[PDB]
Design a protein around this ligand. Structure first.
Ligand code: CLA
Ligand code: CLA
Ligand code: CLA
Ligand code: CLA
Ligand code: CLA
Ligand code: CLA
Ligand code: CLA
Ligand code: SQD
Ligand code: LHG
Ligand code: PQN
Ligand code: PQN
Ligand code: SF4
Ligand code: SF4
Lengths: 73, 94, 157, 31, 143, 80, 741, 41, 35
């Protein structure tokens, strides 16, 4: 639901702000990212939210079904 | 920079104008005292190469597996201890 | 009348601001005097000191809070845990130095806050970070070992 | 009658062999 | 013919108190843009990085992380102040590339002497079907 | 590195050029429309992909078509 | 200069010609609804007076008349509540037996089997059990009569007519000029003294002459029929001297400053009245008199038509320090010329006030027999919590709107607004780090507890019986409050609330208020509250600070406060506007307030509310909070599954309406998920197919059907989400607390 | 009253009055003919 | 269950050793620059 509701723009600004933080935090400027941190793309985060939705759906129902049948029979 | 007034750009001095600074890094030879520096460079001599510092991680993972082989049971841990009866279940099962 | 928040080095177009914590003389002296900002001394001894500090750091949480915190032999098992933690942080340094120092990039350079040119630090190099990783190796396991020995020789524990 | 130690070890060795086959197939697919 | 103006490095900057949205680590190792404009009086404008700055009489020099920030500042100068300006692309090795008013006049006005590339002589619906360009590394619209 | 294309339905109203925030589009002389001007995209490397030009095109269907493609440090609009 | 009344004679004609044409207020809505987007924008921009006219005078007049109309609506609502208390309520019966008779002020018409909702509340009456607490408030005011409630309803209807007449008069006959609205000195001088101070003094007068004698007789125990009417208690000091002997000497000790003789009815004990479980009404009288004097003193601070007083601009501009540059330079001008900034400040402090009201009213009930009715207590707390959170989110929204529209960088150079805008990255990054740290050290503690319980290691989880996390500061603050009387509160005979410590206050066999102990679970849930509040602050503050501009989008102020995006470029700029920050902060406020009210209900059903049996206190759930509220499975099972049995088995009873709403709100919440997860292009293309189907049968509307806009879709989704979640919690809370207690 | 009746003819007023009269008609139908499960003639 | 020691070795191998080596290897390979 997190990726489903919120969209790419709040996260990009937040990541830019955190990149500003790390690029000029003392004792951490020794290391730097090889790949520039960016927000997930719109299609990518739609896919990620869908994947989490399906995984949570399946895990929740499998847990409930197996518990409510095996614990009872 | 040439920032004697309000001029913060200079192509002949483009190093300072871009913003590349040390912030806190300062150059100084004096820090660590004698004999101990040689002691520590001898302690970390041949290990500086990437392959041997990889081999240190290899023997670390060997220790990880040695815990599972003989080390988990030495600190007891319930996963290798004994068991106490059992439970039947909802109906006539086991 | 008194000015305490200023642009850094004059130009108001850089991301920092002069602030009485990011550039107060005591804190600036303390940050410059940390080993990680000693570009003059060899990176191996710097990594040794960093590893010693961090290895002696990591003992405590595992001692007081680990799964075997309530049994007498917590110190040895925590020394083992800290050895494993030092190894994994060591391979983190290995991977970082191998991926970010596979080539060269001599661009622009670096100067001080006053206007004097300074070398661009031997730590930021393939061979330099190898010495730092090797220093963190012997230092990290020694700090854990000294943390184990501190559990038996300290009076107040 | 549960299987023996030698059967488990032989199975694990054959799994190592088929792992070599698997990485050969993967390398061929990457090329 | 038209010649691009040189980037006069020793140009005064607007009065500003220092922001956090200014230059970062991209300026040192990739690129940072810069905008130059002529102001007829001392007056307050708005920075693209946040906050208010006072540009001074005469030449004003401001470096920005991205070209979009430079064009935002230029368009607000052109609308709220009727002030034109020049934007330059400055590489860290030293080379400076002229940017926005490339041929003197603004891009929304014709100049007769530009390059009319990326102008297809067909309609939207006259592109090729994707099956006819299959396994090519190109979209249907760049044929 | 975004593909921006101009098509002959362009009427030369210059609105796509005015809508561009990174100066990608410009007007070149043309003879296919009443205004005797058509849009062109010589600086697509500065294109971020915002599609503000498409939002300003009054032609149905629009004449300045932006195809999002390869992403660079300028197409992603990064200041870091 | 010179505060005075200035108005314009007959600015706007009164007729119905603009009622015929919708969308007249804005130019963009002219030339008819070509699409249904016009229909949606007509309601979207009805109150956006900035987009209707550019004149601050007309905006101010519209705001003033809208305030009058809102006051008329509130007066109609109050008249309806008093009329329902008069006609369709068991208020007189409840007055005789407030301990056992359940309050009710609404009955239903037997039409479709819905007469089952008329509960057997008691007193020979059938109706819906109300949880609003009007009965306790009326008993506190000393009504004890049906005719007086009807008279108050008629008076409130008259006041509503007066409000509507005032709004029409001040928009159409005598509309005040702009400089009348800008007399903030006079407005504060009259709101401090003439509104709040005089209102508190008048309520103290009513409480002295009406509430004290009638409620004193009720507490001593007398049927309300034979109690003397309020006027004859007010008419002569004889009966008052029988009840409060200090009235025999009248106003003489007041003017001679021998005020200590008024100590029988101007008291200061603290605690609760043991007969009713509410606060002592003499203490409330003393409180209202003291704050009335304080507010009337506060009403002379500012300078108007005479030389005495201090100007707000002068006080602001002189509060400048070395760390902040010019300080409060420009704040007077951006608050006397921008309505949205004042709306943001007032909404923030108003929501904080509502939350403080919720806190102070559960902690120590002010009305008689309010503590014993757990239903109205839980409902009042939860309602004020939700109103406070909503108003706070609106404060963030209007701060963002001011930043977009009414913020001028010319008159805001190097001031506090400029200083904050010039280092927004630091503030936002640091709030982000605080949010991450709080999220870890709050939620991961719960997850660790879940994992250790599920691994069979109860000694390793954070709990009172294992690894303790004790709120030592909060416990010591409770101890300081409990030890306050006789030490740091020498004139207090009891502590402010029994929650600090002491004996259990029991009224009618039920606990009014008992001490609350804080343990590990309370520590965890308070840190959860801090984390949720911090994330909501992060979203709202980020929207306000980056409303003007950004690294990604440098010209966000040009695109406006409410725009969907700036295209798929720069990786994607979806929800970059400050409006979408409000849209996300709405969900986060929902989450925060939901956790707060869950903690409230579980904590007081487990450790406060219950019955007394002369050997202990039997709580509603039985002390299960201390051993189950540190585990998410405990919240799901022992609170969210155990207490849900009352609302799902409510069919065939009076709580069947709560049972039905419990499912309908689930439906609405999941209906929100359509608008929140999907996008406009799909619905537009589907609408195109439906338009083809309509064209095939010549039934195409001339007003073109369009899919909801992106901002429209987000607004609909968040509205449905919050409505469904809040109504689910409301039905659950009310059914659970009215079935058991 | 032409403008007032035009306001009464506006879409929200007309739809609210129409759903009001339809709901009232259905309610009085159920008041006089309650519990009509089927169309038994 | 025959050879009870074997899970005690294999589970840390595929939970710590093999995953750490695989993650380090893939992190090295994704930024190899010149493969
Ligand atoms: C019957 C008397 C009357 C008449 C004939 C008018 C006529 C007019 N007024 Mg006016 N007004 C009146 C009374 C009246 N007003 C009162 C009592 C107030 C105080 C609230 C106002 C305050 C006011 C303001 C501030 C403004 C006008 C404006 C206008 C002009 C156009 C707007 C309009 O009416 O569109 C039609 C309006 C409606 C059909 C009604 C609006 C919706 C109502 C107020 C909702 C009330 C709440 C209601 C219970 C719904 C709540 C939710 C519900 C579903 C449960 C118009 C000529 C505007 C103007 O002059 O334009 C510049 C202007 O801005 N009026
Ligand atoms: C002692 C003088 C006094 C009093 C009692 C009030 C009271 C009030 N003002 Mg007001 N105001 C005053 C002076 C006063 N004002 C002056 C001098 C100015 C010019 C600077 C203003 C400018 C002003 C503005 C711009 C606004 C208010 C508003 C309000 C209302 C606040 C909202 C609310 O719901 O409160 C609680 C509600 C009640 C207490 C209900 C009681 C209502 C009665 C009728 C109050 C009668 C007081 C009135 C001033 C008497 C003179 C009017 C007379 C001809 C009938 C409130 C009733 C706001 C409002 O809501 O608009 C209506 C608002 O917009 N005031
Ligand atoms: C003192 C309170 C107050 C006031 C005076 C305003 C005033 C204003 N707000 Mg605002 N706001 C507030 C509180 C307030 N707000 C709160 C508490 C929130 C948090 C939710 C917001 C969040 C907010 C946003 C996000 C926006 C505004 C906007 C606006 C402006 C235009 C409003 C408009 O016409 O849109 C239309 C108003 C409506 C269509 C009314 C219906 C709104 C919903 C659907 C009603 C909720 C349903 C209700 C609970 C009934 C449910 C039962 C149902 C089953 C029947 C206006 C000046 C808009 C703006 O652009 O600012 C310039 C903007 O987009 N506000
Ligand atoms: C409880 C959640 C929920 C509900 C009720 C729906 C309902 C619907 N979806 Mg949907 N969907 C959901 C979740 C949900 N979805 C989610 C999470 C997703 C993933 C994003 C989707 C994605 C999706 C897609 C992609 C599509 C739909 C479509 C539809 C419609 C199918 C037609 C139909 O079955 O008629 C049933 C009608 C209803 C269920 C509405 C309820 C009846 C109302 C309440 C009666 C009105 C009474 C009253 C006046 C209500 C107003 C009260 C107010 C005035 C106070 C339907 C309205 C398809 C569509 O549009 O069909 C053409 C479509 O293509 N859905
Ligand atoms: C599409 C789904 C659906 C259907 C097929 C029905 C069908 C029925 N409902 Mg039901 N209902 C529904 C949804 C539905 N309902 C929903 C969603 C709710 C929740 C609000 C209810 C709540 C409800 C209640 C509370 C009751 C019914 C009742 C009834 C029965 C009464 C028939 C009648 O009114 O006499 C005949 C009506 C006419 C001859 C009038 C027809 C001509 C009119 C004037 C035209 C109207 C123009 C539009 C009927 C079999 C009643 C009953 O007793 O059940 C047996 C009753 O008490 N319904
Ligand atoms: C894909 C099938 C599969 C799966 C899902 C599992 C899963 C599991 N095995 Mg098992 N195993 C398998 C095949 C499989 N095995 C086969 C065919 C053999 C015969 C040689 C064994 C022999 C074996 C032994 C002796 C033991 C386990 C054990 C275990 C458990 C811990 C893993 C471990 O430590 O052992 C490591 C597993 C191996 C060394 C061999 C597995 C090789 C499989 C076929 C790889 C398949 C990968 C798949 C096709 C693609 C995924 C991508 C991947 C390559 C990254 C775990 C639940 C331990 C246990 O009992 O736990 C209590 C244990 O000691 N397995
Ligand atoms: C998927 C495989 C896996 C495996 C095999 C383990 C195994 C283990 N975990 Mg771990 N864990 C995992 C995944 C896994 N974890 C994941 C995915 C998470 C994130 C959710 C965690 C989070 C986690 C936490 C928070 C903790 C553990 C702990 C432990 C240890 C249990 C206590 C003990 O045995 O005493 C001690 C273990 C040892 C003595 C063996 C390690 C050191 C040996 C001696 C080799 C060191 C070599 C060096 C050179 C000396 C155990 C070795 C606990 C622990 O002890 O911390 C380390 C504990 O605190 N795990
Ligand atoms: C299962 C897999 C196991 C794999 C194990 C590989 C280990 C790495 C390896 O062999 O490195 C090979 C290198 C040899 O390099 C080479 O050593 C050569 C000497 S000789 O060949 O070894 O004689 C030398 O000439 C040459 O310069 C140098 O490169 O050996 C070292 O230099 C390792 C020395 C490590 C010393 C510090 C150890 C940790 C200290 C702990 C402190 C606290 C203690 C409590
Ligand atoms: C809470 C922190 C208190 C510390 C505190 O606020 O001291 C107050 C400090 C001093 O400001 P001044 O004395 O300049 O303020 C006086 C007037 O100018 C106010 O405008 O203000 C700040 O430094 C704000 C930055 C706080 C940074 C928070 C981290
Ligand atoms: C949080 C968030 C982000 C921020 C992106 C984040 C935080 C990604 C960072 C995740 C880190 C890397 C941890 C992820 C852990 C995963 C389980 C690891 C998976 C890796 C695979 C190779 C297996 C967006 O960019 C975004 C964009 C559009 C809509 C919604 C969102 C959104 O919700
Ligand atoms: C369903 C859906 C639509 C389609 C929605 C439409 C076409 C609106 C339907 C409204 C109809 C026409 C009116 C129905 C009236 C009801 C009987 C009561 C509605 C409540 C009103 C009184 C306010 C979108 O347009 C959309 C856009 C962006 C993101 C998500 C979505 C989305 O999920
Ligand atoms: S907006 Fe469209 S029609 Fe106008 S010049 Fe640009 S491409 Fe041509
Ligand atoms: S997906 Fe929608 S909100 Fe996001 S960039 Fe595209 S049009 Fe804008």
């Amino acid at each position: 639901f997190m990726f489903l509701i919120s969209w790419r723009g709040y996260w990009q600004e937040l990541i830019e702000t955190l990149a500003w933080a790390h690029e000029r935090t003392p004792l951490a400027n020794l290391v730097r990212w090889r790949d520039k941190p960016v927000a997930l793309s719109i299609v990518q985060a739609r896919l990620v939210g869908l994947t989490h939705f399906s995984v949570g759906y399946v895990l929740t129902y499998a847990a409930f079904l197996i518990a409510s049948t095996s614990g009872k029979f | 920079k040439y920032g004697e007034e309000s001029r913060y750009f200079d192509l002949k001095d483009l190093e300072n104008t871009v913003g590349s600074w040390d912030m806190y890094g300062q150059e100084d030879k004096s820090r660590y005292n004698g004999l101990q520096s040689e002691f520590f460079e001898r302690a970390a001599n041949g290990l500086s190469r990437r392959e041997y510092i990889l081999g240190l991680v290899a023997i670390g993972g060997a220790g990880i597996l040695a815990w599972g082989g003989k080390g988990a049971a030495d600190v007891r841990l319930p996963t290798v201890g004994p068991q106490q009866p059992a439970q039947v279940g909802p109906r006539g099962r086991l | 009348k008194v000015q305490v928040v200023q642009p850094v080095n004059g130009d108001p177009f850089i991301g920092m601001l002069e602030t009485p914590v990011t550039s107060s003389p005591a804190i600036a002296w303390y940050l410059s005097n940390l080993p990680a900002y000693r570009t003059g001394v060899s990176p191996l001894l710097r990594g040794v000191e960093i590893g010693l500090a961090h290895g002696y750091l990591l003992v405590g949480p595992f001692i007081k809070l680990g799964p075997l915190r309530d049994v007498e032999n917590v110190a040895e098992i925590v020394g083992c845990i800290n050895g494993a933690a030092t190894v994994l942080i060591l391979t983190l340094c290995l991977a970082y130095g191998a991926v970010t120092f596979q080539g060269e990039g001599p661009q622009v350079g670096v100067k001080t806050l006053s206007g004097r040119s300074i070398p661009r630090d031997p730590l930021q190099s393939a061979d330099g970070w190898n010495k730092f990783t090797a220093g963190f190796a012997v230092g990290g396991l020694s700090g854990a070992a000294w943390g184990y020995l501190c559990t038996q020789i300290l009076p107040y524990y | 009658m549960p299987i023996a130690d030698y059967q488990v070890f032989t199975a694990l060795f054959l799994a190592l062999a088929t792992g070599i086959f698997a990485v050969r197939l993967g390398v061929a697919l990457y090329k | 013919a038209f010649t691009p103006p040189t980037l006069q490095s020793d140009t005064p900057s607007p009065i500003f108190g220092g922001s956090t949205g200014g230059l970062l680590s991209q300026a040192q190792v990739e690129e940072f843009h810069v905008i130059t404009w002529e102001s007829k009086k001392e007056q307050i404008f708005e920075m693209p990085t946040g906050g208010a700055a006072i540009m001074r009489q005469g030449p004003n020099l401001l470096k920005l992380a991205r070209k979009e920030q430079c064009l935002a500042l230029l368009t607000q100068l052109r609308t709220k102040f009727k002030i034109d300006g020049y934007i330059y692309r400055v590489f860290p090795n030293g080379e400076v590339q002229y940017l926005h008013p490339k041929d003197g006049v603004y891009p929304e006005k014709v100049n007769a002497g530009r390059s009319g590339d990326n102008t297809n002589m067909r309609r939207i619906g006259q592109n090729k079907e994707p099956v006819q360009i299959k396994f090519s590394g190109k979209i249907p619209a760049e044929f | 590195s975004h593909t921006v294309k101009i098509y002959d339905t362009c009427i030369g109203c210059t609105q796509c050029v005015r809508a561009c925030p990174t100066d990608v589009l410009e007007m070149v002389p043309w003879d296919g429309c009443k205004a005797n001007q058509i849009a062109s995209a010589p600086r697509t490397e500065d294109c971020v992909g915002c599609k503000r030009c498409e939002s300003a095109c009054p032609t149905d269907f629009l004449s300045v078509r932006v195809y999002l493609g390869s992403e660079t440090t300028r197409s992603m609009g990064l200041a870091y | 200069k010179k505060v005075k009344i200035v108005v314009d004679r007959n600015p706007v004609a009164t007729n119905f010609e603009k009622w015929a044409k919708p969308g007249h207020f804005s130019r963009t809505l002219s030339k008819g609804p070509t699409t249904t987007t016009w229909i949606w924008n007509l309601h979207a921009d009805a109150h956006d007076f900035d987009t209707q006219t550019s004149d601050l005078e007309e905006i101010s007049r519209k705001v003033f008349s809208a305030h009058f109309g809102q006051l008329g609506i509130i007066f109609i609502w109050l008249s309806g509540m008093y009329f329902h208390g008069a006609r369709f309520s068991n208020y007189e019966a409840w007055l005789t037996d407030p301990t056992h008779i359940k309050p009710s002020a609404q009955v239903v018409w037997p039409i479709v089997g819905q007469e089952i909702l008329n509960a057997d509340v008691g007193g020979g009456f059938q109706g819906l059990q109300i949880t609003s607490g009007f009965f306790q408030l009326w008993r506190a005011a000393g009504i004890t009569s049906e005719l007086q409630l009807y008279t108050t309803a008629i008076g409130a209807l008259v006041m509503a007519a007066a409000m509507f007449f005032a709004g029409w008069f001040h928009y159409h006959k005598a509309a005040p000029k702009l400089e009348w609205f800008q007399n903030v000195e006079s407005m504060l001088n009259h709101h401090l003294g003439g509104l709040l101070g005089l209102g508190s003094l008048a309520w103290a007068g009513h409480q002295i002459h009406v509430s004290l004698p009638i409620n004193k007789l009720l507490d001593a125990g007398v049927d309300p029929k034979e109690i003397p009417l309020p006027h004859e208690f007010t008419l002569n000091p004889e009966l008052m001297a029988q009840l409060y002997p200090s009235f025999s000497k009248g106003l003489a000790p007041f003017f001679t400053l021998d005020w200590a003789q008024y100590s029988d009815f101007l008291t200061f004990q603290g605690g609760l009245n043991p007969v009713t479980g509410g606060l002592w009404l003499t203490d409330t009288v003393h409180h209202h008199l003291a704050i009335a004097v304080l507010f009337l003193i506060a009403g002379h601070q500012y300078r108007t038509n005479w030389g005495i007083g201090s100007s707000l601009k002068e006080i602001l501009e002189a509060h400048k320090g070395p760390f902040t540059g010019e300080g409060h330079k420009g704040l007077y001008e951006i608050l006397t010329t921008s309505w949205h900034a004042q709306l943001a400040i007032n909404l923030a402090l108003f929501g904080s006030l509502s939350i403080i009201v919720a806190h102070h009213m559960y902690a120590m009930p002010p009305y008689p027999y309010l503590a014993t009715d757990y239903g109205t207590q839980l409902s009042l707390f939860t309602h004020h919590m939700w109103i406070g959170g909503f108003c706070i989110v609106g404060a963030g929204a209007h701060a963002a709107i001011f930043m977009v529209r009414d913020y001028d960088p010319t008159n805001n150079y190097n001031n506090l607004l400029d200083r904050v805008l010039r280092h927004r990255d630091a503030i936002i990054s640091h709030l982000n780090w605080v949010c991450i740290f709080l999220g870890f050290h709050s939620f991961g503690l719960y997850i660790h507890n879940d994992t250790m319980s599920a691994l069979g290691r109860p000694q390793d989880m954070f709990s009172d019986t294992a690894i303790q996390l004790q709120p030592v500061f909060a416990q010591w603050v409770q101890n300081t409050h409990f030890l306050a009387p006789g030490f740091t509160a020498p004139n207090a005979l009891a502590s402010t609330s029994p929650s600090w410590g002491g004996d259990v206050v029991a009224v009618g066999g039920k606990v009014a208020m008992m001490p609350i102990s804080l343990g590990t679970a309370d520590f965890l849930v308070h840190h959860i509250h801090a984390f949720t509040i911090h994330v909501t602050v992060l979203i709202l503050l980020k929207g306000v600070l980056y409303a003007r501009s950004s690294r990604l989008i440098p010209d966000k102020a040009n695109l406006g406060f409410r725009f969907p995006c700036d295209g798929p470029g720069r990786g994607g700029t979806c929800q970059v506007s400050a409006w979408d920050h409000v849209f996300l902060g709405l969900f986060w406020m929902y989450n925060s307030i939901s956790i707060v009210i869950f903690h409230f209900s579980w904590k007081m059903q487990s450790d406060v509310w219950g019955t007394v049996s002369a050997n202990g206190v039997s709580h509603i759930t039985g002390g299960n909070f201390a051993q189950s509220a540190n585990t998410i499975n405990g919240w799901l099972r022992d609170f969210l599954w155990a207490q849900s049995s009352q609302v799902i088995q409510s069919y065939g009873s009076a709580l069947s309406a709560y049972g039905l709403i419990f499912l309908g709100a689930h439906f609405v919440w999941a209906f929100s998920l359509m608008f929140l997860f999907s996008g406009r292009g799909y619905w537009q293309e589907l609408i195109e197919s439906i338009v083809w189907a309509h064209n095939k049968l010549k039934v195409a509307p001339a007003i073109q059907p369009r899919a909801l806009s992106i901002t429209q879709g987000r607004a609909v989704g968040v509205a449905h989400y919050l409505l469904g979640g809040i109504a689910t919690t409301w039905s659950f809370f009310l059914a659970r607390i009215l079935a058991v207690g | 009253m032409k403008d007032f009746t035009t306001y009464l003819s506006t879409a929200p007023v007309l739809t609210l009055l129409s759903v009001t009269v339809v709901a009232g008609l259905l309610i009085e139908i159920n008041r006089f003919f309650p519990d009509a499960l089927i169309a038994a003639f | 269950m025959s050879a009870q020691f074997l899970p005690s070795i294999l589970v840390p191998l595929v939970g710590l050793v093999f995953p750490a080596v695989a993650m380090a290897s893939m992190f090295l390979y994704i930024e190899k620059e010149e493969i």
